[PDB]
Design a protein around this nucleic acid. Structure first.
Lengths: 89, 204, 148, 54, 266
RNA sequence: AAAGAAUUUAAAACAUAUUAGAUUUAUCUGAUGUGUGAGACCGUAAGGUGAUUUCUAGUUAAUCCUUUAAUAAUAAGGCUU
RNA sequence: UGGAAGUAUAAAUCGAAAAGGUGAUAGUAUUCAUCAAAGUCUAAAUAUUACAGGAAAACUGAUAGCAAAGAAGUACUGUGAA
RNA sequence: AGAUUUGAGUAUCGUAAGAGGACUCCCUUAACUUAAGCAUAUCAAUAAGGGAAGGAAGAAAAAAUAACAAUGAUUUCUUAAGUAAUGGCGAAUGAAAAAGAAAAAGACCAAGUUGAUA
């Protein structure tokens, strides 16, 4: 006797077998990031995002971030990365 | 290691430190000849990644190229064409400026092999690259099992045939799959194969 | 065979069977399907009356393997195993062994109901079934099985 | 140009069988231009023992 | 009929004619023969997996793939560093797709290793492996004396039941309800007792034999056993099972997930 | 309310617990563990139980088709006039 | 480009990452699946009307077949390309 | 004075050039022609112009397909297929996964670590 070919529980009965490996960094990447950031600083658009964030315009800082990066998800990360610098200071 | 910080630092090209140093370098290269040898690469991280090894037979050449766009070379901008081909401006080169500069260096030094090239800086008028060149007749390069592939005859004038990374990117070899159907194993060869009319010996 | 052509029979005739008033000139109204809406509109209206226009929605990349579904009617089911097997299990009923027709193994995915089945119990295994296909198989005393 | 011609296999096998059959008709064999007046049997067969020594 | 002929370009420069075809056969055949003479197990067309085709249109068929995954080699107890040297294809790029694929290709490799005969690296009779086999030959006699006691005392309760099933089925072909139930009950008990450690790697079959030269191992180890006429017993459950509503319930379940999500946010 | 065995041994993802190390950052790196995810129903006593499907009665939800891994609100495309 | 709210390349401007890309209808979100770009090399199966050496032919047989079956790209024309 | 960096002249040992380009890899925004006119489109990676190669070259070891009982570098042949799609949606242009064969082969740099460091 054979499964079914339609629906959510679809397919011939087998025991399907892969690890969602995470491509990440090590704990030393934080040291490298802090060393480089102090030696270099912030770009012109990073500085302009810091000023908007201080005044409380989070949405405008995201619209500015999206403008200079082009991606909504990358605009979010820059906004969160910048706001973590503001709380450090 | 030292090079894991230089690589991290070199991504912050909009920092004031790197912007200042590139200003000094770009000013200096505006007066020196167009193509000339430099003692050591100005970006040793990027040079080492692309294949430069600080041994005998490896030399670094700096080439300055006038970036931007140019007009179609027609006398007084007059072309006896249909309105579909009557455009003089706004027409862009297909080969990247990096690939064009590589050919200028390779033509200048015909006895060396262009390994790869990278980007140094740019201003309102020029863009400056650096080209890694290898002497194929050096006893050190010939006797290296990991590098004597450059001594093959087919590697003569690599950049002109389109074998370097810069010239291969402009050939379309930047990826694989359904996005690159027309650039499978050579864009011009692919067109010929698809257009071949096969006439078998026994056909209906 | 060039000796059976009409050119060999029209040797000596000046016009070679093409007319003196209206000669055999290069074109006769355009190259290809030219003038599809202007002077050959009576041709396209008469013989291809839905040639010009649009109908249906575009499929940007059609997956033609998703529509593949070979079909077999009920009356043709027994031909998959042959008449020798059909007569051998002719007098079976509930309780004992009954032949199984593997439609998928023969390349048929869906089973449709058309025509009449022989009055013998049978077990039909396939991926899809029709309402009348299952009715006819069950009315004869058989069963239906699913696959994949 | 088209030099070679296709032919279905079952039609090719039909012709060989029909050509083999005609090879056993003495009237058709001689009418083709063969001198078979003296042969014993028109489907002429020789021993496999005699063939092996040639 | 509206004609669609793409001869408006220079097809005369696009014409490819096959006048070299009767000489490709002679080229490829002669080179194929030359390979066999040089080193015969190279043209052997090294062993390849049995992998299903893709898509539902073909998924019931089996065909040769490229290379055994690293998990299939471990299950068959072959080192991946030695597999490539004895005519086995290895594909680390292949992800294990199912347990059944893992088991089927594990049987293929084990069967191949039984038919395999590896000659000594050095033809001299003083080869270290040949000498080593003599040294541990007496240990194998002791060890093989224990491999036979096992699998002669543990697989004995099912062997009689397995024998009885064959005899009862033979008598029927001349009961099976209780005959097959007994074997099934023992099998679950057997499966409950295995739930313990086996060697990581087996030995390479190395000996000195007259060279029987076989041009491919894929046509010796068949992908699929020949298909017979499967026959089944009709029960009342088979008659009752209404397949159409199972198809339509399964389809309607998947098409109502939109309604479920829409009604949640409301 | 009415019929209903469901097919049969070689396994990895890790949701984790619990430990052996290292770390202060937006913290990580091994191993042990149960479930997950598991499917051989109890019958030589007639066969019951039981997943899963059917019909009837109220309930809440969705409801012309598509964007081809699955949904959603925008957008776009289909069908008729 | 067959690639259709952008398949590929290039230019001007902008420009990432405690990663990320793709799932070809733009957008956001949550799952799922599959890979891990931005350096290099790599035989075999494949093409060929340069040219050289051979073998064949339902090909032409001196207005035919290469323009050329003899000192043929020769005699001859043009300032020259030809 | 001395220690370096950088740039030159000279000497020695070598290297590139030119011929050929049938097949191979590319740069460039031709027109005649078709659309019974013509202006996008077609002719068309086609002619001419230019560069670079070898006995073959190009490509090649997945930021690849698929939604399966799933496959697995590249190349070439069959099929998909005049199909999806593109187009004054006109004239016309037009692939690819699957599947079947020929052949089969995988290795390196960069980054990281070892530093009486070579």
């Amino acid at each position: 006797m054979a499964g079914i070919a339609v629906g959510l529980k679809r397919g011939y009965p087998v025991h399907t077998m892969t690890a969602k490996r995470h491509y990440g960094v090590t704990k030393r990447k934080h040291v490298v990031n802090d060393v480089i950031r102090e030696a270099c600083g912030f770009s012109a658009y990073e500085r302009h995002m810091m000023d908007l964030l201080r005044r409380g315009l989070d949405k405008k800082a995201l619209k500015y971030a999206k403008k200079h990066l082009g991606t909504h998800k990358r605009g979010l990360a820059k906004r969160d990365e910048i706001q973590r610098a503001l709380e450090a200071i | 290691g030292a090079y894991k910080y230089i690589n991290a630092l070199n991504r912050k090209k909009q920092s004031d430190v790197l912007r200042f140093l590139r200003r000094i370098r770009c000013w200096e290269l505006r007066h020196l000849p167009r193509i000339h040898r430099v003692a050591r690469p100005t970006n040793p991280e990027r040079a080492r990644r692309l294949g430069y090894k600080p041994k005998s037979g490896f030399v670094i050449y700096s080439v300055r190229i006038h970036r931007g766009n140019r007009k179609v070379s027609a006398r007084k901008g007059i072309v006896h064409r249909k309105p579909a081909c009557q455009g003089i401006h706004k027409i862009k080169r297909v080969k990247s400026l990096q690939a064009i500069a590589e050919q200028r260096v390779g033509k200048h030094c015909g006895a060396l092999r262009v390994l790869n090239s990278y980007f140094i800086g740019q201003d309102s008028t020029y863009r400056f690259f650096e080209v890694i060149l290898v002497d194929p007749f050096n006893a050190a390069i010939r006797n290296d099992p990991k590098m004597n592939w450059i001594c093959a005859d087919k590697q003569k004038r690599r950049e002109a045939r389109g074998l370097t990374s810069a010239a291969k990117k402009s050939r379309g070899f930047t990826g694989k799959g359904r996005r690159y159907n027309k650039i499978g194993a050579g864009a011009r060869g692919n067109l010929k194969r698809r257009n071949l009319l096969q006439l078998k010996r026994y056909r209906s | 065979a060039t000796r059976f052509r009409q050119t060999r029979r029209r040797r000596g005739h000046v016009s070679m069977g093409y007319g003196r008033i209206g000669k055999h000139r290069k074109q006769r109204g355009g190259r290809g399907n030219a003038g599809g809406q202007h002077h050959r509109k009576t041709w396209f209206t008469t013989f291809h009356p839905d040639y010009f226009g649009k109908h249906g929605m575009r499929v940007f990349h059609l997956k033609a393997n998703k529509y593949y579904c070979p079909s077999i009617n009920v009356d043709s089911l027994w031909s998959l195993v042959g008449k020798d097997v059909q007569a051998q299990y002719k007098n079976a009923k509930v309780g004992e062994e009954v032949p199984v027709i593997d439609c998928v193994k023969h390349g048929y995915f869906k089973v449709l109901g058309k025509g009449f089945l022989p009055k013998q119990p049978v077990i039909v295994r396939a991926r899809y079934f029709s309402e009348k296909a299952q009715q006819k198989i069950k009315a004869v005393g058989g069963a239906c099985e699913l696959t994949a | 140009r088209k030099w070679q011609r296709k032919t279905p296999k079952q039609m090719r096998r039909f012709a060989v069988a029909s050509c083999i059959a005609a090879s056993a008709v003495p009237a058709l064999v001689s009418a083709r231009g063969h001198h078979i007046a003296g042969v014993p049997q028109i489907p002429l067969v020789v021993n496999s023992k005699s063939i092996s020594v040639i | 009929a509206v004609s669609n002929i793409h001869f408006c370009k220079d097809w005369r420069s696009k014409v490819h004619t096959w006048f070299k075809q009767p000489f490709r056969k002679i080229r490829r055949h002669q080179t194929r023969v030359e390979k066999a003479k040089a080193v015969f197990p190279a043209t052997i067309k090294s062993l390849k997996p049995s992998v299903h085709c893709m898509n539902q249109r073909f998924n019931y068929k089996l065909r040769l793939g490229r290379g055994f995954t690293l998990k299939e080699l471990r299950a068959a107890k072959i080192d991946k560093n030695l597999a490539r040297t004895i005519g086995i294809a290895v594909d680390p790029r292949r992800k294990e797709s199912s347990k059944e694929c893992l088991n089927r290709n594990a049987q293929r490799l084990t069967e191949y290793m039984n038919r395999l005969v590896v000659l000594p690296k050095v033809h001299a009779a003083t080869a270290k492996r040949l000498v080593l086999n003599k040294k541990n030959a007496e240990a194998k006699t002791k060890k093989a004396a224990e491999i036979k006691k096992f699998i002669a005392e543990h697989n004995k309760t099912i062997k009689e039941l397995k024998i009885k099933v064959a005899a009862a089925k033979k008598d029927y072909a001349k009961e099976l309800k209780a005959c097959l139930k007994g074997l099934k009950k023992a099998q679950v008990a057997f499966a409950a007792q295995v739930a313990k450690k086996t060697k990581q790697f087996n030995k390479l079959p190395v000996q000195q034999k007259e060279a029987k030269q076989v041009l491919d191992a894929n046509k010796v180890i068949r992908l699929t056993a020949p298909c017979t006429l499967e026959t089944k017993t009709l029960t009342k459950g088979m008659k009752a099972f209404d397949a159409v509503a199972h198809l339509r319930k399964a389809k309607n379940v998947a098409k109502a997930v939109s309604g479920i999500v829409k009604g949640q946010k409301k």
